[PDB]
Amino acid sequence: HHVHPLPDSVPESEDLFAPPPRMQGKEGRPKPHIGPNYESYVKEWAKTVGPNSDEWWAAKARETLDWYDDFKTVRAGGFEHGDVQWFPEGTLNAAYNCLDRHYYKNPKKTAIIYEADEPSESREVSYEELMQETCRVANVLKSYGVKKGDAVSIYLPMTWQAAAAFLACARIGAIHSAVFAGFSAESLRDRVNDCECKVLITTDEGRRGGKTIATKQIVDAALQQCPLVENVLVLRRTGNKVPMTEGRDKWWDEECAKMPAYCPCERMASEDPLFILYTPKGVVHSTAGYLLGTALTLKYVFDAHPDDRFACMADIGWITGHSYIIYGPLANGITTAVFESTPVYPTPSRYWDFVDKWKATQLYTAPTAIRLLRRMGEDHVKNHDLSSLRVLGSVGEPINPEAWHWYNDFAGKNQCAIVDTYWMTETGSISIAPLPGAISTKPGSATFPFFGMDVDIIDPQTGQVLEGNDVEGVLVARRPWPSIARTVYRDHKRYLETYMKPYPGYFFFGDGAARDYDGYMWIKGRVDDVINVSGHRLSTAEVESALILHKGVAETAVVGCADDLTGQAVYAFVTMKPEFDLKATKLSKELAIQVRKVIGPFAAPKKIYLVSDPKTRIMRRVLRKIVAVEEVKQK
Amino acid sequence: HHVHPLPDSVPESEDLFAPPPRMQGPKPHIGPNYESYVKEWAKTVGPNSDEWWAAKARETLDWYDDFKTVRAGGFEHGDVQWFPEGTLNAAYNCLDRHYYKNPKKTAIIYEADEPSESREVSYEELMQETCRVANVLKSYGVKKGDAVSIYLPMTWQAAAAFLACARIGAIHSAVFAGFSAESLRDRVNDCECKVLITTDEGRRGGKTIATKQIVDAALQQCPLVENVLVLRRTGNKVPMTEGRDKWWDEECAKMPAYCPCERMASEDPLFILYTSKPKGVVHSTAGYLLGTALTLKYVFDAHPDDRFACMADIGWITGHSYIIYGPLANGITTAVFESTPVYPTPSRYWDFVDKWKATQLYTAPTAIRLLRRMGEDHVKNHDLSSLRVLGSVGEPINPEAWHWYNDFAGKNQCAIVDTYWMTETGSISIAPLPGAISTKPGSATFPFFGMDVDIIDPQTGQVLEGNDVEGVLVARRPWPSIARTVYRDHKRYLETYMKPYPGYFFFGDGAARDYDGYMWIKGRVDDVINVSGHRLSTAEVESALILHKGVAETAVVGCADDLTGQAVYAFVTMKPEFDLKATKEADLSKELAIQVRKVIGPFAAPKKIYLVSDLPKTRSGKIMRRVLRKIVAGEGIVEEVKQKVT
Amino acid sequence: HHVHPLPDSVPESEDLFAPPPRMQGKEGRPKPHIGPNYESYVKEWAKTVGPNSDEWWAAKARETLDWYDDFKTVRAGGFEHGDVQWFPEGTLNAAYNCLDRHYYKNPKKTAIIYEADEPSESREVSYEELMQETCRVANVLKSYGVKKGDAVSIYLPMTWQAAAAFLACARIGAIHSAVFAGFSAESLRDRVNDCECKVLITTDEGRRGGKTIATKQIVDAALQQCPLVENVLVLRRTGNKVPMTEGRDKWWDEECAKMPAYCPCERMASEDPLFILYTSKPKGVVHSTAGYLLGTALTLKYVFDAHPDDRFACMADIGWITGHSYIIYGPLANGITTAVFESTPVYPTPSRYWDFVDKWKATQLYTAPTAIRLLRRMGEDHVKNHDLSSLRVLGSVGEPINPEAWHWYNDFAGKNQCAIVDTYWMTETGSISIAPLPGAISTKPGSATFPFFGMDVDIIDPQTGQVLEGNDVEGVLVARRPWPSIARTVYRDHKRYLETYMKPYPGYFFFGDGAARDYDGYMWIKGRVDDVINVSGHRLSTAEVESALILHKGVAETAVVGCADDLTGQAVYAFVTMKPEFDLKATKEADLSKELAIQVRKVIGPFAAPKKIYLVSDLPKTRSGKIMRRVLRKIVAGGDLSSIADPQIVEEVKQKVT
Numbered sequence A: 001h002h003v004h005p006l007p008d009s010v011p012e013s014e015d016l017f018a019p020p021p022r023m024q025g026k027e028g029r030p031k032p033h034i035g036p037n038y039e040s041y042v043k044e045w046a047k048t049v050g051p052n053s054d055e056w057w058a059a060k061a062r063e064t065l066d067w068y069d070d071f072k073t074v075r076a077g078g079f080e081h082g083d084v085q086w087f088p089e090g091t092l093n094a095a096y097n098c099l100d101r102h103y104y105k106n107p108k109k110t111a112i113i114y115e116a117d118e119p120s121e122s123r124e125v126s127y128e129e130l131m132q133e134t135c136r137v138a139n140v141l142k143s144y145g146v147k148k149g150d151a152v153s154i155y156l157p158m159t160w161q162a163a164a165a166f167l168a169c170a171r172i173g174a175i176h177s178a179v180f181a182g183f184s185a186e187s188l189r190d191r192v193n194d195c196e197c198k199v200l201i202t203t204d205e206g207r208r209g210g211k212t213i214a215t216k217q218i219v220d221a222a223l224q225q226c227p228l229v230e231n232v233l234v235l236r237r238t239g240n241k242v243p244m245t246e247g248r249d250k251w252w253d254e255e256c257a258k259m260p261a262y263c264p265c266e267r268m269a270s271e272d273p274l275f276i277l278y279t280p281k282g283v284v285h286s287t288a289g290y291l292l293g294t295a296l297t298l299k300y301v302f303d304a305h306p307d308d309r310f311a312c313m314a315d316i317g318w319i320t321g322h323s324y325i326i327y328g329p330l331a332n333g334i335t336t337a338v339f340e341s342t343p344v345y346p347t348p349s350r351y352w353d354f355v356d357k358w359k360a361t362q363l364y365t366a367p368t369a370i371r372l373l374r375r376m377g378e379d380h381v382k383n384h385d386l387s388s389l390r391v392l393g394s395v396g397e398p399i400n401p402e403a404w405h406w407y408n409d410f411a412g413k414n415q416c417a418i419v420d421t422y423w424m425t426e427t428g429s430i431s432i433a434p435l436p437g438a439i440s441t442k443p444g445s446a447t448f449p450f451f452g453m454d455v456d457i458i459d460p461q462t463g464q465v466l467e468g469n470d471v472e473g474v475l476v477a478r479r480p481w482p483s484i485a486r487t488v489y490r491d492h493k494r495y496l497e498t499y500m501k502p503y504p505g506y507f508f509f510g511d512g513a514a515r516d517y518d519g520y521m522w523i524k525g526r527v528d529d530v531i532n533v534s535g536h537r538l539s540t541a542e543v544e545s546a547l548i549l550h551k552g553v554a555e556t557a558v559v560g561c562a563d564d565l566t567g568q569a570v571y572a573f574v575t576m577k578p579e580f581d582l583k584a585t586k587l588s589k590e591l592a593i594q595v596r597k598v599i600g601p602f603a604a605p606k607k608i609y610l611v612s613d614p615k616t617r618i619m620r621r622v623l624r625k626i627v628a629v630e631e632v633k634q635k
Numbered sequence B: 001h002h003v004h005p006l007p008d009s010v011p012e013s014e015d016l017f018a019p020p021p022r023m024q025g026p027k028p029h030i031g032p033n034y035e036s037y038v039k040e041w042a043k044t045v046g047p048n049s050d051e052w053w054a055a056k057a058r059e060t061l062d063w064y065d066d067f068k069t070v071r072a073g074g075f076e077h078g079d080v081q082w083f084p085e086g087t088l089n090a091a092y093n094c095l096d097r098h099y100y101k102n103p104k105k106t107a108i109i110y111e112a113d114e115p116s117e118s119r120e121v122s123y124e125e126l127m128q129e130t131c132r133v134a135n136v137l138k139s140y141g142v143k144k145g146d147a148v149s150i151y152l153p154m155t156w157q158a159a160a161a162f163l164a165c166a167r168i169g170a171i172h173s174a175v176f177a178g179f180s181a182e183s184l185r186d187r188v189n190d191c192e193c194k195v196l197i198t199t200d201e202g203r204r205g206g207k208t209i210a211t212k213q214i215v216d217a218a219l220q221q222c223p224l225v226e227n228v229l230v231l232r233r234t235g236n237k238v239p240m241t242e243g244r245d246k247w248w249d250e251e252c253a254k255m256p257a258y259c260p261c262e263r264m265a266s267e268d269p270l271f272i273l274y275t276s277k278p279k280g281v282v283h284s285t286a287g288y289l290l291g292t293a294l295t296l297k298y299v300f301d302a303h304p305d306d307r308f309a310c311m312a313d314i315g316w317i318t319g320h321s322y323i324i325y326g327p328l329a330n331g332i333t334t335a336v337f338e339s340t341p342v343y344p345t346p347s348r349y350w351d352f353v354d355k356w357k358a359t360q361l362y363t364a365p366t367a368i369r370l371l372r373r374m375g376e377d378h379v380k381n382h383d384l385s386s387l388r389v390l391g392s393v394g395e396p397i398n399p400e401a402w403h404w405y406n407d408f409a410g411k412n413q414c415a416i417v418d419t420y421w422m423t424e425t426g427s428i429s430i431a432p433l434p435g436a437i438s439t440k441p442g443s444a445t446f447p448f449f450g451m452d453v454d455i456i457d458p459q460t461g462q463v464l465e466g467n468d469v470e471g472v473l474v475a476r477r478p479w480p481s482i483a484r485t486v487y488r489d490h491k492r493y494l495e496t497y498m499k500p501y502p503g504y505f506f507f508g509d510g511a512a513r514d515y516d517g518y519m520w521i522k523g524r525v526d527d528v529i530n531v532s533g534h535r536l537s538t539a540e541v542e543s544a545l546i547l548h549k550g551v552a553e554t555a556v557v558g559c560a561d562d563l564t565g566q567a568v569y570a571f572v573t574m575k576p577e578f579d580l581k582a583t584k585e586a587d588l589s590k591e592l593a594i595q596v597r598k599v600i601g602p603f604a605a606p607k608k609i610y611l612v613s614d615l616p617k618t619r620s621g622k623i624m625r626r627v628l629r630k631i632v633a634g635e636g637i638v639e640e641v642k643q644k645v646t
Numbered sequence C: 001h002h003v004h005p006l007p008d009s010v011p012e013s014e015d016l017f018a019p020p021p022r023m024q025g026k027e028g029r030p031k032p033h034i035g036p037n038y039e040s041y042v043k044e045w046a047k048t049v050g051p052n053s054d055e056w057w058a059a060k061a062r063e064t065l066d067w068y069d070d071f072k073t074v075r076a077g078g079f080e081h082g083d084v085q086w087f088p089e090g091t092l093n094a095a096y097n098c099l100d101r102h103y104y105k106n107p108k109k110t111a112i113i114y115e116a117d118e119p120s121e122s123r124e125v126s127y128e129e130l131m132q133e134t135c136r137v138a139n140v141l142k143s144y145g146v147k148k149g150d151a152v153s154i155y156l157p158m159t160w161q162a163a164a165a166f167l168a169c170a171r172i173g174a175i176h177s178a179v180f181a182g183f184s185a186e187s188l189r190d191r192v193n194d195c196e197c198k199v200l201i202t203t204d205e206g207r208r209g210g211k212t213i214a215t216k217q218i219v220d221a222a223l224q225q226c227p228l229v230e231n232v233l234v235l236r237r238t239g240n241k242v243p244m245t246e247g248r249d250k251w252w253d254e255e256c257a258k259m260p261a262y263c264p265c266e267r268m269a270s271e272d273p274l275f276i277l278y279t280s281k282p283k284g285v286v287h288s289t290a291g292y293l294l295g296t297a298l299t300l301k302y303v304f305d306a307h308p309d310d311r312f313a314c315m316a317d318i319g320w321i322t323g324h325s326y327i328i329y330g331p332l333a334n335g336i337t338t339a340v341f342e343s344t345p346v347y348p349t350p351s352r353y354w355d356f357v358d359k360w361k362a363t364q365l366y367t368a369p370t371a372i373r374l375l376r377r378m379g380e381d382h383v384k385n386h387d388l389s390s391l392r393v394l395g396s397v398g399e400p401i402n403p404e405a406w407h408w409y410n411d412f413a414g415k416n417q418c419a420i421v422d423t424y425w426m427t428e429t430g431s432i433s434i435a436p437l438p439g440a441i442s443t444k445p446g447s448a449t450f451p452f453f454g455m456d457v458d459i460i461d462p463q464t465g466q467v468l469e470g471n472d473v474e475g476v477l478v479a480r481r482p483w484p485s486i487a488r489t490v491y492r493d494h495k496r497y498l499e500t501y502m503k504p505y506p507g508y509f510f511f512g513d514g515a516a517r518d519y520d521g522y523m524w525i526k527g528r529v530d531d532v533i534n535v536s537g538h539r540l541s542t543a544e545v546e547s548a549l550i551l552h553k554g555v556a557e558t559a560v561v562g563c564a565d566d567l568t569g570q571a572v573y574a575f576v577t578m579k580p581e582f583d584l585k586a587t588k589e590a591d592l593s594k595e596l597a598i599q600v601r602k603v604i605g606p607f608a609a610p611k612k613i614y615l616v617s618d619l620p621k622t623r624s625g626k627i628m629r630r631v632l633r634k635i636v637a638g639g640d641l642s643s644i645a646d647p648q649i650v651e652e653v654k655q656k657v658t
């Protein structure tokens, strides 16, 4: 075999996990939407791609969403000029599909499980309460003069009103631009100024991990260089005294108290911008295509059912919260989780106390969280029930098989489907993932593309498609899909240069990928992070997976630098578990052998640096420029 | 019987008036008896009433986009929804669709202050003038949702201003012509409107209203008003501020006579109407329009060729609903009466009916008591057979005035519909259907479609089930035309109507349901007087006083008394003919107190009676009892009362 | 016969031209939509007029355009108060019907044949390319804050992006106000200020006939007195260095490169204004959306017998209404190919039109009598040796086509195998009002023939105001009822709208033209009523006399006007241009003026002979092509000259008359 799966301590033949009992409609669990085998996935997937897929997408579009005006055309446009259209003649409102229609059917159903930073302060937020709070905010924005198409920045932590802020903008046709509450005043400034918003929504302070986020302090600093912000809505989250600029700044509760608890929905066109999410690339998503994509993926990738309680542990400052905390779940009318704390506050058992308390049916987090909890021991999880869960999802980066097994062993008790969901902020929704009721998973493989995704592997040098299996290269998409980002706000040139120009005719994700002998897709990491040693292209996940196979390795990050013998050299930055006593033990040799043993001599790191902890909310570009979190520069 | 009807000189058994011949079978919409009213009413309330309202909504109004949901929300948080997904335009349903069917049909009977200047305004003429004004507003930058203040007298173009705002999706805020510069100021500043429509001068009762003069004074303290449209009503020279002020006729001559209709959502605000801080009551589009359309059709048994005469002003909700939106929504002829009931003489109302053959008349007890005060010579020698229904609104109509209305104006051949409602209800809430309900003088009778009201004991706070009960009036469920909020003050909206009795809407009136199920509105809860644990209503005492020969108008209030808790103080106005020099003032006040003792009881006898020439009232006609209460309590037409009491 | 056709050298009996074979569905040409005879035109026309025509218009409205929301009422309003309504409850978007729906069907089909001033720089613009550029400009306009209902002035030459600028404004619901590229800074200034636009679209420089149009220079001068214009979008047409005002002025390409290539369509109501077109105070003619779009679509389809694969070539400019209706909206609404001709008829040579036809296989041609008379003045070498068989229909617009020029058109341009459609209408009619349907009507040189669908026209005595029933009658032209494409107002001046067209003859629309209906029912437009000359109580029309003069060998173009005469009331004065080869030295001018005056006396009558004739090199004309007779009238007797093409001619005329 030319394509090698990610290094795992378990042999290959023992590493195929079929849909487990809970995903078979047994043990009181509902029937999956797609099952029972791979063939059932292909039967349905084949309808969503190719020349006869307008019928399927038109039906799913009209069955999944409530429309004000029906659409005539299904799709149009393409990558070349960035004019992708989906259901253009149709009109709808995202807030209507995520709130109103569910409020009209069951007003008392819980929409949001607000898991506060402190476990006792948690509570359920019904669709009625959330709709009221959203219409109040919408009415406040309209009183500030926010019109259809105006940008509104959101700088809110993971409190339940953050969904009301999002949907308040969507309800009136405003483009919300969410900014993670941990971002600095300098980062916020850049995003508030780029979107040219005139209104900003934020908190007095945020609460995460028992520590205070000085949000209103961070806003006041940024706004000194944001001349366009005239109105700032401040939610009273902590109540601590914060500066309030008279005239500009108003309190959420006081403003909403003046407005009615209903607000009419603006009739939006499918291609009206729904939100900007800065990554700075202000990635722009439309309404219908994005909403439909997030709705379908949640239903099928997480096998969501009406009475399910979906728990996505991301932040609404990232696309994961946009798609799989707010728009996706609420569009399907189920319960979604707004988790305000960290995975290790008050203790590393928080995720599991949370599931058992609410009987969560699915969990969705990142490899960074999984590897963190793995470094903290199985005592915080071994003594839990967790039988409510049926599907466990991972997103953000390649999940090392060791973490995948840790995930499957303890969190799922070997009875949950593990969905490795690959996608980007620009894809809008999950692009490659196993349907839990049909796909047998391989640790660290996103498996097969989702409905509407037709992806190929291309040789980056020649630009030629590699037909068949056992191939490796860069990942691309053949055709647009509904939830694809439509542009980069006021920088369409950068939108085309980044995703459409490198390989004309396709969408360029920026990831190296490989399709193994069985057809499973393997995402190996960013193309920029690849290392070419003696003409052999090493992927970042391949080497890092081997290092964590060594007992005591907690997290790694390999980067390259030009070597005067091999072209490029592998340099490693390794974090050890807290128990590995580096005073008694002199290790860097045992790790390099681990690479030489599992990968090959060419992959052996030329130098290894043992470090205590750069990451986002892993910055390998930082590690590259250093060799070419100040401890890294010192070590 | 525990619940007592309003004192009447006619004994009870002789005081039930069945639907008279004119309201008998062409055919009324609901008839011929009470059961015919209940069979239909039952469809409009309860858990199975969506079918009826969905049908009525789609049959009564033209929609751009149909609605999916019928109703949602409730009182608790003030999120009432009706037909939310639907879209429509008020101007389209009041003008366009009728212009398309019969453009030459008369929409407005403009009865000018001088009878000779009257004329008919067709739907074509009204629609053109409405599109012209709408085109002017759009040229000023008025967008959907922007507030526009209207300060116009009772000239027919006032309907054009209303519907012009509704046509483009602007929220008009009408202010009664004659309010001071200060009252206007507060309403213009609260709604934050950037455009104001008014006249050069108004004409009412042979007197000139200096509207533009009052506007210029107010705008000195209204910084947001950039454009003022001035209608040339009299032509007398008035100041015009360059840039800000433009002439109605000159502006409209630049614009086309058609304007596209803004596609409004059911719950988009239609107008703000401030009540005498100033409470800006807000009404939506679909629910309000439907309510005013249905009530007009069923409460006044309106048919296509009728000529509806509501003698109110467009500055009050009565003019909003039953001069403009209600009648014109049904596509009939409506009256814009610019004069007073007594100009040139007290025969004006009746000269008006016979001139135009009015089929219904709608006015207030304050006007009825006025004509009663002016003698029956001005009405006895008129025909008035065109009328089928006579309506009363604003406050309880004493049975003494009810009979005068019934005897002379209707010649005992018209149904008398006592219509109870408020600005916040949008449309008539309790009233007898004239083709089905037998009336009692001073009784609103039974609730309208969509209104399910109960009596609640204010002490216990519990609903009193059954008949022969008395308490405070409340509604069980929202209805389409209910006000949606108070402009930029939703808290005051909830605290005033929804929080006092959670789960219900609190009107603010004491009411009683007699042994037959008839509802009796006895006056404001604030006006109730607690004498030794007995709650006296203002209607009970004032009705007894006007029964005494010579009494023109009365108003009783309460004040802190030691032995009985509160004491009843009376302010009585005598007819101008009453020789108060020949009769002793003490002898008269004694006969009045005994009159109260005879029909109500000893506890109701006024501790002191004050003979005054006139009582302080608002411009809508309501009597200002709060003022009389604070004056008697020593907490300093108002200079005469404070001086006489001393 | 009382009504006389325009003087023609061909006798009458030899002057009836039936639909030729190319218009009969033979030779493989498509079948006409209406044919084959007059009875077939009236059969369909009668459905479009009177009180029983709502069914037809509702069906055509729903068959011709894609609607977001359907309409309930078909028509309402009238002339009296200027409240004309058509399909009011309906909603649609012009850009959607001219671009989107055609992009969705065949994105690679050519929408615009861009014939640049230089033939080599020409190319085809697909519906995909035009839609993308239109959505980009719309997105730029939205980024400038342009809202539904805002005016946007366009000062663009005849480059294909002018269609993108138009449709970008319509796409977002903006009212574009086009001004012909070449108007002075003063004419532009007055039009930018009247529409109160805050955005202006223009080029750095224009190119027409090998000459440079200093568009940005004229814009910079005009905007010095236009305080409301905050943003100027400048298209890079030539690339020559032009002044750019920092902040205000931005480059089309740089701005569009920042925006996506798709933009949602604004849902416009039928009666929302689509554009303002000022005519030479400035008269801002306003057109609505649905009715205008329907009219331009139907007229193009039926007056030019347009079929899906046709290549329509309207040689006008988007600065006047002919380009609005029969370069952009009409053709693109039908989803066919249209031509953006940037040059002149004689650049590089007078063979350009014909090089153009054979180059692109144009299926129809649409130009003005001034262009036809120009090419006739330049000799048959430039046209005789061309194929031109792609053509099936040849159109004339702007003024009466003299029978002499009509024959030249029919003989050389059509090689006696094309239908000649003389299309009468005004900027205020929106679309062609009177014209022969080429597959059904047999034509007479210089006759607009019969009214188009929705047009019911009468002849009225201008003095008595009475309708002249029947045939062989003469008077002034009026319309009985509103039609879909009729102008709805004059921008912010509805008073001038009513006083000009609705008040003169209450109950009708007053075109301002003298007309006559001959014994056969054919309509004859005789010229402006203002241009009529009263000689001894005889009402002379400008078309009959000018047609008579051009019958004289050597005459290129003429223009007669009226003047105060002390004996006959008014006297006929003539301005005649001879072909360049005509030796005015060998032939005596006084002898020519005698032969011309006799030519007029022989065909018309003694009263029609010009009292004085002036030989001039050219005439004062506008860019639309109609001769400015008011200028010649006021000069002869001893003010709205914005469209004056060559102001130099007025100085030669003022010298040659004094």
Ligand SMILES: Nc1ncnc2c1ncn2[C@@H]1O[C@H](COP(=O)(O)OC2CCCC2)[C@@H](O)[C@H]1O
Residues within 6 Å of the ligand: A279, A318, A319, A320, A394, A395, A396, A397, A398, A399, A420, A421, A422, A423, A424, A425, A426, A446, A509, A510, A511, A523, A524, A525, A526
């Ligand atoms: N399952 C996965 N397996 C391997 N790589 C993965 C996987 N999910 C994400 N990635 C990497 O994340 C980038 C995009 O991240 P971003 O769009 O910034 O954040 C978004 C990403 C999804 C939610 C937050 C991809 O281009 C990849 O490199």
Ligand SMILES: Nc1ncnc2c1ncn2[C@@H]1O[C@H](COP(=O)(O)OC2CCCC2)[C@@H](O)[C@H]1O
Residues within 6 Å of the ligand: B275, B316, B317, B318, B392, B393, B394, B395, B396, B397, B418, B419, B420, B421, B422, B423, B424, B444, B507, B508, B509, B521, B522, B523, B524, B620
């Ligand atoms: N038929 C009636 N019988 C007894 N009382 C009545 C009756 N009609 C009104 N009222 C009192 O008027 C208030 C409302 O006043 P307002 O807000 O001006 O509403 C407008 C609505 C029409 C004119 C007043 C009620 O709440 C009552 O107190």
Ligand SMILES: Nc1ncnc2c1ncn2[C@@H]1O[C@H](COP(=O)(O)OC2CCCC2)[C@@H](O)[C@H]1O
Residues within 6 Å of the ligand: C279, C321, C322, C396, C397, C398, C399, C400, C401, C422, C423, C424, C425, C426, C427, C428, C448, C511, C512, C513, C525, C526, C527, C528, C624, C626
């Ligand atoms: N076929 C024709 N036969 C005789 N006269 C005609 C003909 N077409 C136009 N006209 C005269 O042009 C005026 C309108 O000019 P304009 O407003 O520019 O409209 C534009 C619309 C087309 C180009 C001019 C008419 O009122 C007439 O006088």
